[PDB]
């Protein structure tokens, strides 16, 4: 019932988001046995965050924002309202069921309803860009699908072949980007690094070096669904010497998984393994670092490479910038921020994607459309500490339109 909550304010953002209502036509109903005016309701609560600590929970539809009714008001609203306190921010807020929380409530009468509202976009004059980026940026990419489905039955035409041709310019990238399950997305992102002449090796690097071993699986198998071709075959093609080698070996997605015991003599001997093959001799045993980087699980190489600075006496990203060049040297210390820091490894992709001259919007749109929503929360917070004013701030700054406000709908707040 309604519950009071106090969250304390830090420059790592409350970690949390609000959201309207998807099921706003059907579903809205009595929470928790008393029904009310529309609400938002809390879309992700990061673990561990200020939210999480505080009591948030997901689902929780909001009342009061620091003592104010916000009931009925818009998202914008509400995120100007949080964003309004100086040192807290108080909530009264009213817990839900799991069910009504977990995404199960979404029924196909909602896929056809957002169907039917994007189809009505579609065909006013001018296309009615808002509408389709308020409904699509605020839908799991799961229910995408499901309105995707609904869309070709009603219309006998797909969405996305649909959208393509009512869209344009970088909103379009977007939004093709979304209709697309997390395994097609990468697969077609990939295909796109190795088409043409050259490689687009900074795309290539950036999502082999980040997916996990579920995430590369699922990419092997609907990237030969889609193309008829291994994904490795094409890297194979694409790449070349010591690049291809560690490309070849990570996209496997065959890294160790997390074990229950940390191997303590392992990783004293993959730190003096990795010194032998590259500072402490002229050269570098290039096999060597790729096998023991490709192979042993996250937890275990982040120790590794604090280990390694007892041997060393540059850490394991310097070494890399001392050792090697290129193409392997990109890959090498892309993959080792991936390892020591994902969620900052993300942020600092973001920042470099946005901080100079224009816009590197291929590097900026692929992050907003692939992240989760609550590893979107772990990234604004790196992000918010380590350059001191929001993702959302810089995505305002660097993007206009239409376009900023779908990237400020994924980036899913304020900090
Ligand atoms: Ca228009
Ligand atoms: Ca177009
Ligand atoms: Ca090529
Ligand atoms: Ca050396
Ligand atoms: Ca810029």
């Given at each position: 019932?309604?519950?009071?909550?106090?969250?304390?304010?830090?420059?790592?953002?409350?970690?949390?988001?609000?959201?309207?209502?998807?099921?706003?036509?059907?579903?809205?109903?009595?929470?928790?046995?008393?029904?009310?005016?529309?609400?938002?309701?809390?879309?992700?609560?990061?673990?561990?965050?200020?939210?999480?600590?505080?009591?948030?929970?997901?689902?929780?539809?909001?009342?009061?924002?620091?003592?104010?009714?916000?009931?009925?008001?818009?998202?914008?609203?509400?995120?100007?309202?949080?964003?309004?306190?100086?040192?807290?921010?108080?909530?009264?807020?009213?817990?839900?069921?799991?069910?009504?929380?977990?995404?199960?409530?979404?029924?196909?009468?909602?896929?056809?309803?957002?169907?039917?509202?994007?189809?009505?976009?579609?065909?006013?004059?001018?296309?009615?860009?808002?509408?389709?980026?308020?409904?699509?940026?605020?839908?799991?990419?799961?229910?995408?699908?499901?309105?995707?489905?609904?869309?070709?039955?009603?219309?006998?035409?797909?969405?996305?072949?649909?959208?393509?041709?009512?869209?344009?310019?970088?909103?379009?990238?977007?939004?093709?980007?979304?209709?697309?399950?997390?395994?097609?997305?990468?697969?077609?992102?990939?295909?796109?690094?190795?088409?043409?002449?050259?490689?687009?090796?900074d795309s290539?690097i950036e999502i082999?070096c980040s997916?996990?071993?579920?995430?590369?699986?699922?990419?092997?198998?609907?990237?030969?669904?889609?193309?008829?071709?291994?994904?490795?075959?094409?890297?194979?093609?694409?790449?070349?010497?010591?690049?291809?080698?560690?490309?070849?070996?990570?996209?496997?997605?065959?890294?160790?998984?997390?074990?229950?015991?940390?191997?303590?003599?392992?990783?004293?001997?993959?730190?003096?393994?990795?010194?032998?093959?590259?500072?402490?001799?002229?050269?570098?045993?290039?096999?060597?670092?790729?096998?023991?980087?490709?192979?042993?699980?996250?937890?275990?190489?982040?120790?590794?490479?604090?280990?390694?600075?007892?041997?060393?006496?540059?850490?394991?990203?310097?070494?890399?910038?001392?050792?090697?060049?290129?193409?392997?040297?990109?890959?090498?210390?892309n993959?080792?921020?991936?390892?020591?820091?994902?969620?900052?490894?993300?942020?600092?992709?973001?920042?470099?994607?946005?901080?100079?001259?224009?816009?590197?919007?291929?590097?900026?749109?692929?992050?907003?459309?692939?992240?989760?929503?609550?590893?979107?929360?772990?990234?604004?917070?790196?992000?918010?500490?380590?350059?001191?004013?929001?993702?959302?701030?810089?995505?305002?700054?660097?993007?206009?339109?239409?376009?900023?406000?779908?990237?400020?709908?994924?980036?899913?707040?304020?900090?």
């Open positions: 019932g309604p519950r009071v909550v106090r969250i304390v304010k830090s420059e790592s953002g409350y970690g949390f988001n609000v959201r309207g209502q998807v099921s706003e036509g059907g579903q809205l109903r009595s929470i928790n046995g008393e029904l009310y005016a529309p609400l938002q309701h809390v879309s992700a609560v990061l673990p561990g965050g200020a939210a999480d600590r505080a009591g948030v929970r997901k689902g929780d539809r909001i009342l009061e924002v620091n003592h104010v009714n916000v009931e009925g008001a818009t998202h914008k609203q509400v995120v100007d309202l949080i964003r309004a306190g100086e040192k807290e921010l108080i909530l009264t807020v009213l817990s839900v069921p799991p069910h009504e929380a977990d995404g199960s409530a979404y029924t196909n009468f909602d896929a056809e309803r957002d169907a039917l509202n994007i189809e009505t976009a579609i065909k006013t004059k001018g296309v009615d860009e808002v509408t389709i980026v308020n409904i699509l940026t605020n839908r799991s990419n799961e229910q995408r699908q499901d309105i995707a489905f609904a869309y070709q039955r009603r219309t006998k035409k797909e969405l996305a072949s649909a959208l393509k041709s009512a869209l344009s310019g970088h909103l379009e990238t977007v939004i093709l980007g979304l209709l697309k399950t997390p395994a097609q997305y990468d697969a077609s992102e990939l295909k796109a690094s190795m088409k043409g002449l050259g490689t687009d090796e290539l082999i997916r996990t071993n579920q995430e590369l699986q699922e990419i092997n198998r609907v990237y030969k669904e889609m193309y008829k071709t291994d994904l490795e075959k094409d890297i194979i093609s694409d790449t070349s010497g010591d690049f291809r080698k560690l490309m070849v070996a990570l996209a496997k997605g065959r890294r160790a998984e997390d074990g229950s015991v940390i191997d303590y003599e392992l990783i004293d001997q993959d730190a003096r393994d990795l010194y032998d093959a590259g500072v402490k001799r002229k050269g570098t045993d290039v096999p060597k670092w790729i096998s023991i980087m490709t192979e042993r699980s996250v937890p275990h190489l982040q120790k590794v490479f604090d280990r390694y600075k007892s041997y060393s006496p540059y850490d394991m990203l310097e070494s890399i910038r001392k050792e090697v060049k290129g193409d392997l040297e990109n890959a090498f210390l993959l080792v921020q991936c390892i020591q820091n994902k969620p900052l490894y993300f942020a600092d992709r973001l920042y470099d994607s946005m901080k100079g001259k224009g816009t590197r919007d291929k590097v900026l749109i692929r992050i907003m459309v692939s992240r989760s929503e609550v590893d979107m929360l772990k990234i604004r917070s790196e992000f918010k500490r380590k350059y001191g004013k929001s993702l959302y701030y810089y995505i305002q700054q660097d993007t206009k339109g239409d376009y900023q406000k779908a990237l400020l709908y994924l980036c899913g707040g304020d900090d």
